[PDB]
Tab-separated table of C-alpha atoms and ligand atoms in Angstrom:
chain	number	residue	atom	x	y	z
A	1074	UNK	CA	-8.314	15.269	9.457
A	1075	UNK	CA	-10.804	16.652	6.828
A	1076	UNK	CA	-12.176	20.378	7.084
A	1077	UNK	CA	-15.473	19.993	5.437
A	1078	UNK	CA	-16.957	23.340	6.739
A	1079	UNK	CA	-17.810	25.097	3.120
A	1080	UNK	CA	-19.279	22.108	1.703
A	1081	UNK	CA	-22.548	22.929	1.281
A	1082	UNK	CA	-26.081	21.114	1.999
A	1083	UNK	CA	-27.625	21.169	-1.126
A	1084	UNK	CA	-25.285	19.457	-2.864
A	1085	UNK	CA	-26.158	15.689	-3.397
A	1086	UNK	CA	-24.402	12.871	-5.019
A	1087	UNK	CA	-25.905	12.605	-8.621
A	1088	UNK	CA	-24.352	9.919	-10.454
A	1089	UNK	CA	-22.106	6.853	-9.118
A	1090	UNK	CA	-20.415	4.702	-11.881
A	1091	UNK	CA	-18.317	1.771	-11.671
A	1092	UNK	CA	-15.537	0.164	-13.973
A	1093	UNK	CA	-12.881	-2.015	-14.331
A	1094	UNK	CA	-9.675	-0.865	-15.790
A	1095	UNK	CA	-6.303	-2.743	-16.911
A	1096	UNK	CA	-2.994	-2.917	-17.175
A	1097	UNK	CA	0.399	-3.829	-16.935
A	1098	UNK	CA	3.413	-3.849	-14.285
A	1099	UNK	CA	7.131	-3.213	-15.967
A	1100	UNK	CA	7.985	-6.368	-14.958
A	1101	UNK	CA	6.454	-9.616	-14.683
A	1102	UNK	CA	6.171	-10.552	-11.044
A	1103	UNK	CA	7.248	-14.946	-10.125
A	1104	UNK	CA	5.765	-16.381	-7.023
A	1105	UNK	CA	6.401	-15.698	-3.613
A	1106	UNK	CA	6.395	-17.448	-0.564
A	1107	UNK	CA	3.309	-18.994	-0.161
A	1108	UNK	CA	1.315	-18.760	-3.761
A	1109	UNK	CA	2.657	-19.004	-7.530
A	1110	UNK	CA	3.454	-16.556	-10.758
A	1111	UNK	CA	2.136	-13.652	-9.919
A	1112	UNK	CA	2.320	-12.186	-13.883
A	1113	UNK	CA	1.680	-9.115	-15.692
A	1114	UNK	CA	-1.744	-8.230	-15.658
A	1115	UNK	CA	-3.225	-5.385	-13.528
A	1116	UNK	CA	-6.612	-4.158	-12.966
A	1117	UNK	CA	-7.966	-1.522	-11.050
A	1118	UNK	CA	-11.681	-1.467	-10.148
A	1119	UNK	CA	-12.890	2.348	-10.153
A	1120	UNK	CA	-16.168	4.287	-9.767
A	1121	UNK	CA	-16.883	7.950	-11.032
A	1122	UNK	CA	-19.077	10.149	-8.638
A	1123	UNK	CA	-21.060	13.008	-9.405
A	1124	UNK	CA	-21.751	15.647	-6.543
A	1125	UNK	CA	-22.983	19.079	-7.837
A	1126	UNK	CA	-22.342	18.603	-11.292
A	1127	UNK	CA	-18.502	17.572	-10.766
A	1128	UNK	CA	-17.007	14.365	-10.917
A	1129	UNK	CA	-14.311	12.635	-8.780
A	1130	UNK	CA	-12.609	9.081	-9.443
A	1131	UNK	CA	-11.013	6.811	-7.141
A	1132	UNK	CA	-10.807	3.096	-5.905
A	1133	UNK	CA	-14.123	1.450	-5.472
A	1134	UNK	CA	-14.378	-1.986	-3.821
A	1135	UNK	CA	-17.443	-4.195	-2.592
A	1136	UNK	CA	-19.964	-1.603	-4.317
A	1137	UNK	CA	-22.895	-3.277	-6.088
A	1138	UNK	CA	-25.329	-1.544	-8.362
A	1139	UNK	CA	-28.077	-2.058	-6.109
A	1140	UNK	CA	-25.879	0.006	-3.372
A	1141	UNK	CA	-25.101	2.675	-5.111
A	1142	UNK	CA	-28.424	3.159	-5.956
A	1143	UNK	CA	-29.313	3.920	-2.264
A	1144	UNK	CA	-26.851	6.367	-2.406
A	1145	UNK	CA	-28.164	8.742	-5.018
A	1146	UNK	CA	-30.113	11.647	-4.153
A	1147	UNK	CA	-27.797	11.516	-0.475
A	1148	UNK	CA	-26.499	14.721	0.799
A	1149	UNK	CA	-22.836	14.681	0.732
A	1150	UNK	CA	-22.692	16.273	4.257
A	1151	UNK	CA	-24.346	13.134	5.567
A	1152	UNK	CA	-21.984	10.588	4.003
A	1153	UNK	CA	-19.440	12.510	7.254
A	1154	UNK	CA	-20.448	11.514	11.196
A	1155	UNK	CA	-20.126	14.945	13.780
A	1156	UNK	CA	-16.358	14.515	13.582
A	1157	UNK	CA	-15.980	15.353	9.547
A	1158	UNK	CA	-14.817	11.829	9.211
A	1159	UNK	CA	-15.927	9.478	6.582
A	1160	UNK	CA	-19.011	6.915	7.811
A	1161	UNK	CA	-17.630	3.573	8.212
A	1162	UNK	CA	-20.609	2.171	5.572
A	1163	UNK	CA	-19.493	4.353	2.852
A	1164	UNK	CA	-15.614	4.223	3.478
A	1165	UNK	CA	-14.486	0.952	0.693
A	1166	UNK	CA	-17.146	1.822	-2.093
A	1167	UNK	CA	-16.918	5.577	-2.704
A	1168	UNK	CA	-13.928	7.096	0.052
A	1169	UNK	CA	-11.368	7.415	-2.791
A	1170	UNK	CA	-13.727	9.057	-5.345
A	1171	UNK	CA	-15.339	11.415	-2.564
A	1172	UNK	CA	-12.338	12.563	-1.529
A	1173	UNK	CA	-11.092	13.176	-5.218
A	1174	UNK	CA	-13.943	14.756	-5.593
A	1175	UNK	CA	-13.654	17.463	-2.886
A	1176	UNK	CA	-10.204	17.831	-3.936
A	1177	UNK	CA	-11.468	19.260	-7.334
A	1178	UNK	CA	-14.229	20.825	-6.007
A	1179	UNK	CA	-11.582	22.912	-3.572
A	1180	UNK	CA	-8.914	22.643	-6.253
A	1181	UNK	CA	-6.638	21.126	-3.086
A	1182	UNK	CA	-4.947	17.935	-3.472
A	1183	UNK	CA	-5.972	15.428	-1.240
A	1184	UNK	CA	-2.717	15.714	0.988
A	1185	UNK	CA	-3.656	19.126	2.251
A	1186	UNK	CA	-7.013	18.257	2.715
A	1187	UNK	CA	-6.108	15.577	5.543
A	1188	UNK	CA	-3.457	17.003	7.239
A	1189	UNK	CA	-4.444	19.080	9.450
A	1190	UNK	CA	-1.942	21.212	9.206
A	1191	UNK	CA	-2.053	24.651	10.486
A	1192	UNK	CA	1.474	26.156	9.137
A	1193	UNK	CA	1.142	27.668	5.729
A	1194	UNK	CA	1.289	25.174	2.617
A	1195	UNK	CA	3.143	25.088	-0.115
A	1196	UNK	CA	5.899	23.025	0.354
A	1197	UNK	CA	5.955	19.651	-1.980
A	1198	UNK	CA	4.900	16.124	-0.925
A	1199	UNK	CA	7.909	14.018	-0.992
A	1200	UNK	CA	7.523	10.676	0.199
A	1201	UNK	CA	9.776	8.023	0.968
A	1202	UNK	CA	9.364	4.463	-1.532
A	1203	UNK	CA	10.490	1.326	-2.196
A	1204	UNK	CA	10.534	-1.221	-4.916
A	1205	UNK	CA	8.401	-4.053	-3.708
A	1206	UNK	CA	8.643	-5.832	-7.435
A	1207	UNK	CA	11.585	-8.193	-6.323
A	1208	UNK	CA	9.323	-11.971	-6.302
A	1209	UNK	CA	10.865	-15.429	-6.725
A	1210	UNK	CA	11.989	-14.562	-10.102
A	1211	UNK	CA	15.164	-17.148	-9.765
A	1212	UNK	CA	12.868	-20.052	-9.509
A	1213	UNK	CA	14.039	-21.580	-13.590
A	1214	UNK	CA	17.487	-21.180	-12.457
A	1215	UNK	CA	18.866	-24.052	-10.434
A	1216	UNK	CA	22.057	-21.875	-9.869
A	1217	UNK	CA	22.389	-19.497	-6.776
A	1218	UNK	CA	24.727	-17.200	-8.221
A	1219	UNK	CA	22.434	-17.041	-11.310
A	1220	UNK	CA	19.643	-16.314	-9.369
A	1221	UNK	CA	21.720	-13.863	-7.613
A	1222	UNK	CA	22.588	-12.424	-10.693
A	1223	UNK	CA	19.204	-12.325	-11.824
A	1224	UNK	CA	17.390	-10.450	-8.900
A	1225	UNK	CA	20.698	-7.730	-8.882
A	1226	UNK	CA	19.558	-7.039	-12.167
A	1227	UNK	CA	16.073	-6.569	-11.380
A	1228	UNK	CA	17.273	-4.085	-8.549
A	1229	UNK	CA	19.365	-2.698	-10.996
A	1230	UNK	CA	16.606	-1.942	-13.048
A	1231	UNK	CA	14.116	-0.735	-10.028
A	1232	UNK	CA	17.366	1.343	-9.453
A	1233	UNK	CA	17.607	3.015	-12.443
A	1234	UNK	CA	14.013	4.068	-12.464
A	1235	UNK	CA	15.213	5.934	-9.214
A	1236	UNK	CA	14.590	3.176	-6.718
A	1237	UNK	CA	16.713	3.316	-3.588
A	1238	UNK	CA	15.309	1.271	-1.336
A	1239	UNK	CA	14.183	-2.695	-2.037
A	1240	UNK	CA	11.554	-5.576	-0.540
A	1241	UNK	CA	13.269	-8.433	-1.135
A	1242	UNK	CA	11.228	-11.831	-1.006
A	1243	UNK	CA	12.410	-14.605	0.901
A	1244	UNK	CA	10.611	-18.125	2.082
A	1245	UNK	CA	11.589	-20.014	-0.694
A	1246	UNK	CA	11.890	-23.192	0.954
A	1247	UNK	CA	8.335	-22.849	2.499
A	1248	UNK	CA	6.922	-24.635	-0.264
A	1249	UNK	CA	8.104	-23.469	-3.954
A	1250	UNK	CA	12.269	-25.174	-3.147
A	1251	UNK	CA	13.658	-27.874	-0.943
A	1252	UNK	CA	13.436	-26.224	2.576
A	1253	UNK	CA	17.182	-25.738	3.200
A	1254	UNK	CA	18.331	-24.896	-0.518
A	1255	UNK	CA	15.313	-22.293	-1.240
A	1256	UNK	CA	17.016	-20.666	2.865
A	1257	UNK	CA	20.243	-20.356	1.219
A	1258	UNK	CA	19.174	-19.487	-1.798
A	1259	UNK	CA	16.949	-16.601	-0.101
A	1260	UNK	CA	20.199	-15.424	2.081
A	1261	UNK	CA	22.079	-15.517	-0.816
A	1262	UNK	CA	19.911	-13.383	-2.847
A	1263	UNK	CA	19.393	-10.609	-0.219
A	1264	UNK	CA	23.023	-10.746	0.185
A	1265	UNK	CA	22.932	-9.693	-3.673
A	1266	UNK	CA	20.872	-7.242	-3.527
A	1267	UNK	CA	22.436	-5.812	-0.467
A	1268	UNK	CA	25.675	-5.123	-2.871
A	1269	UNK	CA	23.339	-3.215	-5.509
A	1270	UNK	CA	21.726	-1.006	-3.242
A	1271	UNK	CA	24.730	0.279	-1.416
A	1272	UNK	CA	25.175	1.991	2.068
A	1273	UNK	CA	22.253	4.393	2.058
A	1274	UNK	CA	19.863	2.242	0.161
A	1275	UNK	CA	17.314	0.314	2.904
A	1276	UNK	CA	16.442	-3.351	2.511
A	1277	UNK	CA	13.151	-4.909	3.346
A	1278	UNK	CA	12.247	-8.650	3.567
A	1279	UNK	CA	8.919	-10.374	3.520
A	1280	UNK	CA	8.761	-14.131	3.988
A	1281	UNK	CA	4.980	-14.360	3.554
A	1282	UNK	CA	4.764	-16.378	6.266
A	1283	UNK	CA	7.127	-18.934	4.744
A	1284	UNK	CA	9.252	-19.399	7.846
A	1285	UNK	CA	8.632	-20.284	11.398
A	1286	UNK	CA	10.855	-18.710	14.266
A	1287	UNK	CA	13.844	-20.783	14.238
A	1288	UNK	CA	14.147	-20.480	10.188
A	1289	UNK	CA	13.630	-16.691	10.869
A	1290	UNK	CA	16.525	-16.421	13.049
A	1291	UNK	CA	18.785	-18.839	10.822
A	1292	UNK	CA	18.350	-16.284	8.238
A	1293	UNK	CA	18.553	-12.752	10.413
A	1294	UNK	CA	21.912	-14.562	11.567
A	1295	UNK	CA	23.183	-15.456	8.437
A	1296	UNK	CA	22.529	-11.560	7.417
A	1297	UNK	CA	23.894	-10.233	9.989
A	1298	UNK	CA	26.543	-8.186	8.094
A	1299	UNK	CA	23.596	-7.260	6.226
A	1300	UNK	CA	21.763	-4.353	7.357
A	1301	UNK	CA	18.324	-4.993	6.992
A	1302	UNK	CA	15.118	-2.595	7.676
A	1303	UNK	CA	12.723	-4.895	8.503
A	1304	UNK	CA	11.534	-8.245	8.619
A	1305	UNK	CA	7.994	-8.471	7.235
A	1306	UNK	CA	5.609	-11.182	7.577
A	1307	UNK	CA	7.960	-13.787	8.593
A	1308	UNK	CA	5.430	-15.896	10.095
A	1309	UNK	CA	1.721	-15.668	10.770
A	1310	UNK	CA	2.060	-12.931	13.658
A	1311	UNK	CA	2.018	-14.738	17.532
A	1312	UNK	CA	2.911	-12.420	20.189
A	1313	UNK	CA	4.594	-15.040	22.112
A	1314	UNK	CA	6.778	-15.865	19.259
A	1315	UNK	CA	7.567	-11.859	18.610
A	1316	UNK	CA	8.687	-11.241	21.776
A	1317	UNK	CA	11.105	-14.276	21.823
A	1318	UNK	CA	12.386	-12.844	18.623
A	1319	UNK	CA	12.915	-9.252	19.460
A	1320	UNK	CA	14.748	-10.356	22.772
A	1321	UNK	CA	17.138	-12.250	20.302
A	1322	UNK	CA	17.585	-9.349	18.479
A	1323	UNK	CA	18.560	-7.303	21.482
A	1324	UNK	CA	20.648	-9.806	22.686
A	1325	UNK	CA	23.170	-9.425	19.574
A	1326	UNK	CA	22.494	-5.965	18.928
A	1327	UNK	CA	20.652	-6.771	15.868
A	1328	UNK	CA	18.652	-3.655	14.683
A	1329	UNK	CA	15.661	-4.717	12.701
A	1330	UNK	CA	12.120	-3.545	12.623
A	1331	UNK	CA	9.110	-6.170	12.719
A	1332	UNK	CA	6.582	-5.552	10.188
A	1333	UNK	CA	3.282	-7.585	9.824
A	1334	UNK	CA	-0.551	-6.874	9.693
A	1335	UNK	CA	-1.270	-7.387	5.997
A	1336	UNK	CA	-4.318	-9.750	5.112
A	1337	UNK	CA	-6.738	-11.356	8.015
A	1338	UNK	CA	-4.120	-9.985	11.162
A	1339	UNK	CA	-4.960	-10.966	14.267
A	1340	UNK	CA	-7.423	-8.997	15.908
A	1341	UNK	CA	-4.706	-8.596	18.472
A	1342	UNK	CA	-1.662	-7.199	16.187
A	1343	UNK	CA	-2.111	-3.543	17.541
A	1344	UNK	CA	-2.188	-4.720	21.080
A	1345	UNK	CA	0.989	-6.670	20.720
A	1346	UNK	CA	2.225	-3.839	18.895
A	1347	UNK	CA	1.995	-1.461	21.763
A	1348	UNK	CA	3.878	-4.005	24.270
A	1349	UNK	CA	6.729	-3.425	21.654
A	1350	UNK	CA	6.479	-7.386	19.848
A	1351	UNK	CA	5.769	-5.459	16.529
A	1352	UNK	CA	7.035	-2.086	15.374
A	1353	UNK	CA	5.340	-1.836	11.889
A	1354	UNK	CA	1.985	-1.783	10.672
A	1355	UNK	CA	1.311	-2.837	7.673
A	1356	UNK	CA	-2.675	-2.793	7.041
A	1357	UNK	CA	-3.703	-2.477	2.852
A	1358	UNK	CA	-4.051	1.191	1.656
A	1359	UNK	CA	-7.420	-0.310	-0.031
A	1360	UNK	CA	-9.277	-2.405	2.624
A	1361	UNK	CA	-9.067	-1.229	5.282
A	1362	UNK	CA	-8.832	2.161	3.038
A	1363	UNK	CA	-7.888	5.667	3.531
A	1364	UNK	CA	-9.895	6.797	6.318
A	1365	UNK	CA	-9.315	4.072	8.516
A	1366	UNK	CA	-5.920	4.511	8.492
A	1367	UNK	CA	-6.380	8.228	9.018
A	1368	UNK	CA	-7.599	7.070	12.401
A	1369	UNK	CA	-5.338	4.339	12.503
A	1370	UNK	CA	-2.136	6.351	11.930
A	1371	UNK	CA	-3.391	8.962	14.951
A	1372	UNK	CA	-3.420	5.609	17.267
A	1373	UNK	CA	-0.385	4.336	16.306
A	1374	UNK	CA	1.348	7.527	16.419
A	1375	UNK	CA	0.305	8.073	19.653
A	1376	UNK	CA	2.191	4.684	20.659
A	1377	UNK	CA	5.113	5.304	18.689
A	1378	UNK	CA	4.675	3.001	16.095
A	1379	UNK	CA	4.879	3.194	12.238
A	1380	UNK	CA	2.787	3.079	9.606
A	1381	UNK	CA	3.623	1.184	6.317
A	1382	UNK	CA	0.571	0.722	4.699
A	1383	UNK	CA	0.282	-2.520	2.137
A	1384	UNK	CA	-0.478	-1.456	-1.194
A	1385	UNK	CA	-0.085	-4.589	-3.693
A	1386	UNK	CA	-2.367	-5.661	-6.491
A	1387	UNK	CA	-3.868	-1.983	-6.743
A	1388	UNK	CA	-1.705	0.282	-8.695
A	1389	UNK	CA	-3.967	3.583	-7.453
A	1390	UNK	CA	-3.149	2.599	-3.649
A	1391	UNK	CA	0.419	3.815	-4.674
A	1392	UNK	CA	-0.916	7.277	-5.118
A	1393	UNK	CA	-3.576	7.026	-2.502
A	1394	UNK	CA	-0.831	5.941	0.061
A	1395	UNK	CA	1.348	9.180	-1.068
A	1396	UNK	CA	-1.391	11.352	0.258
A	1397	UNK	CA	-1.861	9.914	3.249
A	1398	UNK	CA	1.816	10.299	4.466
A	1399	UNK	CA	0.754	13.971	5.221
A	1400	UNK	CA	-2.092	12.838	7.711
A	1401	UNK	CA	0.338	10.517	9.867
A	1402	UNK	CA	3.648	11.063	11.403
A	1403	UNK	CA	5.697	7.962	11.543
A	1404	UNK	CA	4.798	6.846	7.895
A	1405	UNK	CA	7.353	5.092	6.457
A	1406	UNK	CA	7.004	3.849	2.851
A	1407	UNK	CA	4.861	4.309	-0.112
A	1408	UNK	CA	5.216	0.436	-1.432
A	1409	UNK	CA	5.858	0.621	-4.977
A	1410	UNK	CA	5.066	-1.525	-8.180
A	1411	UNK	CA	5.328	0.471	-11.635
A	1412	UNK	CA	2.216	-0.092	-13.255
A	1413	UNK	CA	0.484	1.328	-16.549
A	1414	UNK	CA	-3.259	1.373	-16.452
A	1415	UNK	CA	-5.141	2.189	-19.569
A	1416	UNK	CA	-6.994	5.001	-18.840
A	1417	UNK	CA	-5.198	6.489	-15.502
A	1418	UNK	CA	-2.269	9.079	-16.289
A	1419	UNK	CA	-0.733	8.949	-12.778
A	1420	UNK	CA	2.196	11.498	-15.282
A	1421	UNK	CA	1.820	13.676	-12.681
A	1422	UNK	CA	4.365	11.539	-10.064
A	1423	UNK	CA	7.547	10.998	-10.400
A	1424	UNK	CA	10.575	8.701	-8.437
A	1425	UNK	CA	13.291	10.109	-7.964
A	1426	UNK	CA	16.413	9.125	-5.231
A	1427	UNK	CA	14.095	6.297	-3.128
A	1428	UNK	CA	11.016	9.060	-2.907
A	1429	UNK	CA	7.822	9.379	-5.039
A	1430	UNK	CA	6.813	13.023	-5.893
A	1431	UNK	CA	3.522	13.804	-5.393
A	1432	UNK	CA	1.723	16.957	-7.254
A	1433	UNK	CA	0.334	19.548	-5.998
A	1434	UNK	CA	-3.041	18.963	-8.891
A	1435	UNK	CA	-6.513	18.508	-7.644
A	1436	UNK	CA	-7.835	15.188	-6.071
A	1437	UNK	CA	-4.997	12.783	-5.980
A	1438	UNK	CA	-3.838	14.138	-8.614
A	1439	UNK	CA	-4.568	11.448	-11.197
A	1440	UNK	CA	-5.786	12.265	-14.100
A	1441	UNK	CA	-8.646	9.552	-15.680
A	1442	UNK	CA	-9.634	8.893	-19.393
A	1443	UNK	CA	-13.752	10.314	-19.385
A	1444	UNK	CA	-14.396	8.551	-23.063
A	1445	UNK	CA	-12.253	5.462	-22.225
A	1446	UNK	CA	-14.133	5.048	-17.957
A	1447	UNK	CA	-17.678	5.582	-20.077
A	1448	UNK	CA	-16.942	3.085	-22.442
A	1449	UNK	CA	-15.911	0.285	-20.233
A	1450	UNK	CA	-18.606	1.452	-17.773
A	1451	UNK	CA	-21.226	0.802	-20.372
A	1452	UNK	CA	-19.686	-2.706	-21.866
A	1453	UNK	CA	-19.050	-4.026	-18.463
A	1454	UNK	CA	-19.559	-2.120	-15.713
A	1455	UNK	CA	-22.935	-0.433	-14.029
A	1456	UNK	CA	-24.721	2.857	-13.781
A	1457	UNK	CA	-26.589	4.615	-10.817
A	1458	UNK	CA	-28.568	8.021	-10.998
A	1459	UNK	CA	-27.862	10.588	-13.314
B	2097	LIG	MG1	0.780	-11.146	9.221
């Protein structure tokens, strides 16, 4: 985890500040399963700490004015418990610009700061991704091969970009198409986008929650000359109903992961995961965070299982979710959405072949705008300390 033996007592956090910043992904993003257009616009809520007369940005969530104010004058030793991990109460507001913030202090990046590695470093960060920008796009077109057509060329372009690997979105039927037209229509597109991606490239669906068992294993059969990664989120996760569907998928040989655990998961999701109904786990890269899924990725490590953490909605989870893949062992994916955020040159990644490159810079590596934070931090965001 994090070695936080040379940071010193005396030095406190100063300053917290807290903006808003926006953007814009490549491509506008349709519906999905359950919910409508999804669009263009991107924002990223961010806070600027000051520890010792250095600053670190990052993610800040559920951080009020009034808390952050309780915070200044705090040593930074005691934001850590007696295990040099993160407390619990400080983890969503300030984790990501704390841990920037040691990484400039230390001039490490973030990745060998958390894991624990013991062999020398050096060696780049290069993490596996995927293009999780493929949403109901189709819906205007009432013809399947156009809307075939249509999402190969939006692979096509994640492809080009150096994409390998795709998250396709099915469920159409659940409520945005007639139930068995919007099936055949999803088939038919991951069949599509199966052809685009060729032999080595991996194909992910997510259903968000759109189907129930039955539809799920309509659609696994129809793909069956399809190989597919994983099935995400095909319905609200039910142990009962997971274990009927992985015996069905031993029973024809069928070799596809089960991912789930996005959004309010049952409270159960990591036991059933360890009886084997669920081999993927998908908690957000934002809430729970970073250092949860430090701990998290330890567990499910220790069971086997893999860690996929959800990153959409938050273009600087895609970064913070490249760092962690040194701190667990059985990570599988940095999810991917090409964003531009004013104010947040993230120039230092690149994609290249199905993998994001992470830098070996400072922090995570991202590189913020002071003039353009302090502007929109006095218009419309807050101030603690100095
Ligand atoms: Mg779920």
């Amino acid at each position: 985890s994090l070695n936080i033996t040379g940071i010193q007592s005396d030095w406190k956090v100063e300053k917290i500040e807290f903006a808003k910043l926006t953007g814009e992904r490549a491509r506008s993003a349709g519906a999905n399963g359950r919910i409508g257009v999804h669009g263009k616009s991107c924002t990223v809520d961010i806070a600027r700490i000051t520890i010792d007369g250095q600053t670190g940005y990052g993610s800040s969530i559920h951080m009020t004015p009034e808390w952050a104010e309780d915070v200044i004058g705090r040593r930074l030793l005691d934001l850590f418990d007696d295990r040099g991990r993160l407390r619990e109460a400080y983890r969503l507001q300030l984790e990501y610009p704390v841990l920037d913030w040691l990484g400039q202090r230390q001039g490490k990046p973030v990745y060998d700061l958390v894991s624990g590695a013991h062999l020398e470093t050096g060696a780049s960060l290069v993490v596996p991704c995927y293009d999780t920008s493929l949403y109901f796009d189709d819906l205007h077109l009432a013809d399947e091969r156009a809307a075939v057509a249509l999402m190969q060329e939006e692979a096509m372009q994640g492809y080009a970009k150096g994409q390998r690997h795709f998250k396709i979105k099915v469920g159409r039927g659940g409520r945005h198409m007639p139930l068995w037209e919007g099936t055949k229509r999803d088939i038919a597109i991951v069949r599509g986008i199966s052809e685009v991606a060729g032999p080595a490239g991996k194909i992910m669906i997510d259903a968000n929650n759109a189907y129930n068992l039955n539809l799920t294993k309509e659609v696994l059969a129809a793909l069956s000359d399809v190989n597919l990664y994983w099935l995400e989120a095909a319905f609200h996760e039910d142990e009962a109903l997971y274990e009927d569907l992985k015996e069905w998928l031993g029973q024809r040989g069928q070799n596809v992961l089960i991912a789930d655990g996005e959004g309010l998961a049952s409270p159960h999701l990591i036991e059933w995961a360890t009886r084997g109904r669920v081999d993927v786990l998908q908690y957000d890269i934002i809430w729970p965070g970073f250092t949860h899924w430090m701990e998290l990725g330890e567990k499910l490590d220790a069971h086997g299982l893999r860690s996929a953490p959800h990153c959409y909605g938050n273009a600087y989870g895609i970064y913070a979710s490249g760092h962690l893949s040194a701190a667990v062992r059985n990570f599988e994916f940095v999810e991917y959405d090409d964003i531009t955020i004013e104010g947040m040159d993230v120039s230092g990644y690149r994609i290249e072949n199905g993998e994001i490159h992470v830098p070996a810079t400072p922090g995570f590596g991202i590189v913020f705008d002071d003039e353009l934070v302090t502007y929109l931090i006095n218009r419309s965001g807050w101030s603690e300390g100095h």
